[PDB]
């Protein structure tokens, strides 16, 4: 498995970053958003055999689409909300709902990163960058 | 032969699952429907050389299309109702009837899984996943 | 040479089968038709270098189209009535006559296998199946 | 050089056959026509580097278009009337004349084989069959 | 392996991308980059690294960098898209982004001045990376 | 270099032939025309690296297009009138004039062989045949 | 080790690119280049180097050069696009640029005169790099 940073190509310096909870980067349920690139453990990810992006902050922390379309790290499971695949420079969630849309990883403003309907995902270019 | 789980890509957590008959998963004629993924043996399957999906619940149990379009596990034979092939993420039965239609493995509501005429199969995406 | 059964994809359970004559399945001139699949000696065939389908029932027995379009096993010779080729899942005779048509291995009714002019051959899908 | 029989696909049992003259199959000028296939030497042919079809009846016997469009075996020379090429199942002579036409090996009635203008050659399908 | 190249214009009969430096010193961080006639010295040799940065051979840790005013400098190497470059045929394209919905191309904007320019206006923007033997 | 006869496919027996001058096949300026095929040295040719067809009649004799479009053998030089290339069964001269047409080796009547404008070259099929 | 080629026209039955030189001296810098019948002497032999220059065998350091007025000379070798050449099929195309926004092609412009000509006017512009060795 390749350890990578997930660096935005829609912003001059933003990487996908485990904010954590109250300084604690290792906590289950910790928030994920954007930050200037520095490649510390909370910015390194690995894509496993189940299409989950595992964080290097600790064991058993997977990038997770939440109901409100925000991002956290959570214990790894089988949910499609934890599955990801690439199409060119688009990073797409396998998450499904009644809206008949694919959801793309996308900068929604400032350092906020969420998933956004494909048609409306305007800052959704990423590069998996080998550490 | 590769042992796989058959996970839905049309539902955020559904796998093809041997319910059995009265809690007994090994019974011939036991029901097959959907359930959340946990990869126990009643959710593991193997596609043999005769295009049958063998269940790991016990020997000689093949995924079978019934006349009412529901699914069971039965003793393995030559019937087309036990034969399956992939097209992309669609899992297609070789079963024929008087409808000039192919039948696709499909979620028809809740955790109910059946085969549905191709034109009407709108929750019929699956991913075979190595165990 | 691959030894196969010839199973219909147009009928849920029918294989090309040597019936024989009066119980005797080794006799030249023995009848060929449809039966449920069991893979026993009288359902096993092999396509030779001369495009003949040889039967496992005895040496020197070839699948043969007759005048009236029924099928028998006969001694192997050079006649086009004994030559067969595949186009996708269609199995076609090289037999010629004055009727401006190709003849396809086909099911008419439910139990009777014969060859049929192509344009009327509505249940003519087959699968050569190893073992 | 691969030796073949030249079997018709427009007739259920006809091969190109050196008749000879008065029982002698080896004689120069000997007639060529059709016969049921038996694969003896007077039905075996080889395409040489000059595109001549050499008969196995004897040395130096090539399939030759005569001025009346009948066929004989003759001593091998450079004339286009001895040159042949395939195009699908059509076997075409390089013979030229003022008729703006290609001449195809063709059954013209019964066991008579001649070459015929392409737009009128109705029984002109052949298959070279390896021995 | 990183190839040492000159970046020669195909839109001007004799212009290479060149570290001007400052005050005669070609090694300074923040030194200007523009065009000059080709001579292939170290301040004209470049190498594309695994992070898509064009490193100058003039000194360690000098990367071709798009500035806010679209001029070019060499700067200490980091992660910013302003230092990332990719080829499409003979166009050398910056990964720099802003609100103008455009790609920026390496472009001669007049005389020996080289900047990046919006794609639809980049008329002297053809380049050839040319393998250059480097003397130690 | 591969020695060939240049045999016509537009005439049942014609090969490109060095006639010579006064019975002498070796003379520079000797005429080239057609003749029945016998494969003696005045009918054997070799295409060299300069695209010249060298005759085996004698050293330093190349097939040459003359201003009047007749053919000779001449001392080998650099002129395009001595260069030839194949497209399919057409043999084309590199010869140029102000008419902006390509010239093809062509039978123009009986055993007369010349070069002819491409559009009008109707007996211009050739086969380079290995000796 | 550059392959020895002549640059022979396919638009004229016998014309090669040829260093005329000056007053019989084929080695001189700024020597004129035009056409002549093909004889393969060193003033007609060329080599394409790694910088896309056609070097003449008349002397060290002599490259085929497009001049401002579109005539051709041999000159000391340098980096100028005016000395760079590439092939597309039987067209030999210069990298020279100017204000006209055209590619320039090696072209016969009358008798033995060879220049470069704008692409869409170049009617005697077919060439074959012909191997000598
Ligand atoms: C080096 C490091 O961990 N820095 C983190 C940063 O990546 C980001 O997560 C931020 C969120 O507020 O907090 C910082 O402490
Ligand atoms: C771990 C396990 O076997 N769980 C099964 C489940 O897969 C499903 O078959 C369900 C049907 O009602 O019954 C459960 O007991
Ligand atoms: C089990 C078995 O072999 N059954 C054969 C069947 O294949 C078919 O040929 C039939 C025709 O009457 O005869 C049976 O004896
Ligand atoms: C076995 C054999 O060679 N049979 C030949 C047959 O091929 C055919 O040429 C025929 C002509 O009338 O004569 C037979 O003797
Ligand atoms: C030999 C050399 O380095 N020449 C440089 C040139 O490359 C360019 O940078 C110029 C900037 O004004 O200064 C010159 O001194
Ligand atoms: C064997 C031989 O060389 N025969 C030549 C023939 O090929 C042709 O050139 C003819 C023209 O008149 O003259 C003959 O003498
Ligand atoms: C054999 C030889 O070198 N002849 C040259 C010719 O190549 C050409 O350069 C010409 C220009 O006027 O001058 C001649 O002296």
Swiss-Prot record, chain G:
Coiled coil: none
The organism's place on the tree of life at top rank: Bacteria
Disulfide bonds: none
Ranges for domain Ricin B-type lectin: 3-130
Family: Belongs to the HlyA hemolysin family.
Its job: Bacterial hemolysins are exotoxins that attack blood cell membranes and cause cell rupture by mechanisms not clearly defined.
Protein's name according to its UniProt entry: Cytolysin
Origin species: Vibrio vulnificus (strain CMCP6)
